[PDB]
């Protein structure tokens, strides 16, 4: 006969100030007095459990709260969310459906159905559900999940529009700006990428995920010292990260500091022995340093990690040409020219190998293949014309 929810306000005020100690005591007292049926000493207790690592007792207590209020869309939403926090997404979908047939006007059900169908690789239903989630109430996370769908399924041609429309409003989210800048890097545009990365860096100066891409873009267009300073900005925050040290080694390899680049690249390779980019960089630098015994080793590793590349086999063949193994260089160059489409350096180097082998016959074939493929490198220009005039 006492009032059922006597102290829901006090429990809510203790839980909302991040106490979780006095709130639990008041929850226990209320439940002991009311013998259950409170529906908010169980709800807040389950939310507290979910705040801790445990997502099992949270699911149990949300089940009890759903049993108490069988027609209450929020309880079904919370139970499906406790499912989705575990690995079960089909059951999460089937509980979100019931939560939707009691409330057809909320964005959370549609956003969560989208993120579930994403984990279930059902992209039509996920895409349509997230379009709905936008139309009900546009949120940043729905935009992010839609961009993720359009990236996984197809091309950036569908993601650039969504990310631009997303950053259009609420443009202070670093994730949206940075992801749109990254997707600009993924395409030919290097200017708007710099624009959005600088927009991010104004808000957060020490953003590691943005500093990395900005330094990459800088390294691409020379001026290695600016990228080196960008990396100095974040070096202490991430002192052991293979990508940072790989980019720093490429910085030091740009300005002819080959030893201080081998150092950084080997350090990054030790912290990630399965990363083909660092292996390719080590092979390239050991080629430039004229060592030709470690270059082959690192390039063969990077081949064994990403075999469907053209430049890898070209560099391995250049390492084999100076290792007194010309037949292996022949077959490696054949692999490369078969596996390369838009890099004439491979063709020119194979023409050089052939002409140095005394053939001069197939060297013309490789020269014609290169000239069909084609344009900026200063030293690939001269050998282009020298192997031409001398053939």
């Amino acid at each position: 006969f006492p009032i059922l929810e006597k102290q829901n306000w006090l429990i809510h005020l203790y839980y909302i100030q991040k106490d979780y100690e006095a709130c639990k005591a008041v929850i226990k007292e209320q439940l002991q007095e009311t013998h259950g049926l409170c529906e908010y000493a169980i709800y807040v207790q389950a939310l507290i459990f979910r705040l801790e690592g445990n997502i099992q007792e949270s699911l149990r207590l949300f089940q009890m709260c759903a049993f108490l209020s069988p027609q209450c869309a929020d309880n079904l939403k919370q139970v499906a969310r406790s499912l989705f926090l575990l690995g079960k997404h089909k059951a999460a979908i089937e509980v979100y459906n019931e939560a939707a047939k009691l409330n057809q006007k909320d964005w959370e059900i549609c956003h969560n159905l989208g993120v579930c169908y994403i984990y279930l690789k059902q992209f039509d239903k996920a895409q349509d559900q997230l379009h709905n989630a936008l139309h009900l109430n546009r949120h940043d996370l729905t935009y992010i999940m839609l961009g993720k769908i359009f990236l996984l399924k197809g091309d950036l041609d569908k993601a650039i529009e969504i990310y631009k429309k997303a950053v259009e409003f609420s443009p202070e989210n670093t994730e949206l700006l940075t992801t749109l800048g990254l997707l600009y890097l993924q395409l030919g545009i290097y200017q708007k990428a710099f624009e959005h990365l600088g927009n991010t860096l104004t808000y957060d100066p020490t953003n590691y995920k943005a500093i990395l891409a900005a330094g990459s873009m800088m390294q691409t267009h020379g001026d290695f010292d600016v990228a080196l300073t960008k990396y100095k900005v974040v070096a202490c925050a991430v002192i052991e990260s293979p990508p940072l040290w790989n980019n720093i080694g490429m910085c030091f390899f740009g300005k002819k500091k080959y030893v201080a680049a081998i150092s950084c690249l080997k350090r990054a390779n030790y912290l990630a022995p399965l990363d083909w980019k660092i292996l390719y960089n080590l092979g390239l630098v050991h080629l430039t340093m004229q060592q030709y015994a470690s270059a082959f080793h690192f390039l063969s590793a990077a081949i064994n990690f990403q075999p469907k590349m053209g430049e890898l086999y070209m560099l391995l063949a250049v390492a084999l040409t100076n290792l007194e193994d010309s037949e292996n260089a022949k077959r490696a160059y054949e692999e490369a020219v078969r596996l390369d489409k838009c890099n004439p350096l491979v063709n020119l180097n194979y023409a050089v190998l052939l002409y140095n082998q005394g053939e001069k016959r197939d060297a013309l074939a490789q020269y014609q293949e290169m000239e069909k493929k084609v344009s900026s490198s200063l030293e690939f220009d001269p050998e282009m014309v020298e192997v031409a005039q001398k053939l």
Partner: protein
């Protein structure tokens, strides 16, 4: 040093909140007291306590825990002190001159009554120091009751989609009222004229821990340790980040300088007064503070009274005169690189020969292991490893076995131990294993016992095998430690 400190005490057990603590005139003569419905030291004993000066003058028991306490003038006939409407249960105790004067009851629901949680006042027509104010109650049932000047009849009933937690009333009730309600579902709903339903809602993403209304901007304190300034139409205009959690937000308004700035009682033992976007007059406290109030307490237009999370009181009177670690390389490195540059071909050839021989020997050992079936990891998915525990003549030998497959159980399997029957006495050296469900580590334990009077450590083999086959599916080895017998 803009905040002149007045009193710092720690024995005052005052565990009130930022909404059930209000100061106003209570006996005329321009002497403002501060009435607060304080809980128990834990929350068991509801006690109404009023403060004049900095000595406690009257604390008296209360029926139930007060959910809010706000003062207001009930009528303009010879204006005496405002009435203190303290909310408790489904009831509103209206105190006149800090004496029990009236007990308003909430009209029940078809019994299933409700409880009132949030309570503020609203201005009728004048909005001055002598105007008449009307209550606005937030029932636990999702309803807002706009009451009368004398707390006996209802003037309006507003429907809200979720239980309110915080309330803000702006304007005058008759012609221009704005009611902002921070609910439990993490949303602010605004109520205007002619709208029984808000239809202008704003979600915060986290449950609002506070609500203070500035003349144009409405600040919402988030559970994510920040403030978010919105407009009264439903469009956010700014957001500022806090370094720690937000425990209580109140309003600091001084009319001499026209400064109406929101406060913030952060959990990092500090309080920072916030205008539109700038920080100023940040203070420190010996302990994080749960409730702050700014008004004309005592006889000063700039008093701010604050209660520590652990109790105690701190009253402050505002003065009116406001490069990299790139490694190094030694001679060894350049000599080694010179050797590599002059003898790279021999190194390449001999390393390739060594790699060929290594592939040969690794394949040899892999085939020999497959023959003897000595791999504890080996279509036909399984994984077993045996742990030994304990010194002394009796060891506990637990085999952790696991089926590693998507969804396929393994019905018929059995474990057989191979030991030296003169050194170890295994009770059951052969036993069936339960149905292995994919994904669960089954610990199957046995009690090995050393029999040798002298310390002798001998290996023990374990074979897991089908019941229709004779070749072990997999195996494991354990070097039994020394006995330490008697």
């Amino acid at each position: 040093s803009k905040w002149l400190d007045s009193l710092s005490d720690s024995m005052a057990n005052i565990h009130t909140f930022s909404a059930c603590l209000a100061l106003a005139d209570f006996h005329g003569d321009g002497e403002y007291k501060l009435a607060m419905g304080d809980l128990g030291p834990d929350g068991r004993q509801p006690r109404l306590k009023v403060l004049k000066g900095h000595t406690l003058v009257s604390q008296k028991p209360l029926p139930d825990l007060p959910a809010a306490a706000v003062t207001f003038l009930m009528a303009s006939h010879e204006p005496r002190t405002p009435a203190l409407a303290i909310a408790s249960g489904p009831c509103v105790y209206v105190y006149k001159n800090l004496k029990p004067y009236f007990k308003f009851s909430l009209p029940s629901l078809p019994r299933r009554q409700t409880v009132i949680t949030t309570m503020t006042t609203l201005k009728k027509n004048l909005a001055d120091e002598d105007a008449v104010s009307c209550l606005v109650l937030g029932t636990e049932n999702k309803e807002l009751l706009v009451l009368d000047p004398e707390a006996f009849t209802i003037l309006a009933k507003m429907s809200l989609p979720s239980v309110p937690a915080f309330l803000e009333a702006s304007g005058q009730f008759d012609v221009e009222f704005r009611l902002a309600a921070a609910c439990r579902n993490g949303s602010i709903y605004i109520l205007r004229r002619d709208s029984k339903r808000p239809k202008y809602c704003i979600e915060l993403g986290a449950q609002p821990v506070g609500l203070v209304g500035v003349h144009k901007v409405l600040v919402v304190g988030s559970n994510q340790d920040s403030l978010h300034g919105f407009t009264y139409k439903g469009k956010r205009l700014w957001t500022v980040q806090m370094p720690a959690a937000i425990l209580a937000m109140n309003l600091l308004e001084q009319h001499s300088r026209g400064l109406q700035a929101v406060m913030a009682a952060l959990a990092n033992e500090e309080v920072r007064i916030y205008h539109d976007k700038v920080l100023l007059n940040v203070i420190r406290t010996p302990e994080a503070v749960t409730s702050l109030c700014f008004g004309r307490y005592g006889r000063e237009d700039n008093t701010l009274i604050m209660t520590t999370l652990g109790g105690g009181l701190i009253i402050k009177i505002l003065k009116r005169t406001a490069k990299l670690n790139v490694p190094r390389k030694t001679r060894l490195y350049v000599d080694q690189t010179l050797r590599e540059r002059e003898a790279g071909t021999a190194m390449h050839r001999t390393f390739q020969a060594d790699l060929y021989l290594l592939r040969l020997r690794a394949a040899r050992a892999y085939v020999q292991a497959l023959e003897s079936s000595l791999s504890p990891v080996s279509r036909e998915p399984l994984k077993l490893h045996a742990v030994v525990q304990g010194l002394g003549p009796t060891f506990k030998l637990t085999l952790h076995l696991q089926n590693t497959s998507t969804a396929r159980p393994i019905l018929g399997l059995v474990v057989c131990f191979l030991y030296n029957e003169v050194l170890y006495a295994l009770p059951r050296a052969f036993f069936k294993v339960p149905l292995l469900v994919p994904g669960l580590n089954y610990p199957l334990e046995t009690f090995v016992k050393s029999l040798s009077d002298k310390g002798i450590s001998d290996i023990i083999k374990v074979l897991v095998l089908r019941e229709g086959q004779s070749t072990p599916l997999l195996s494991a080895h354990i070097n039994m430690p020394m006995s330490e017998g008697l």
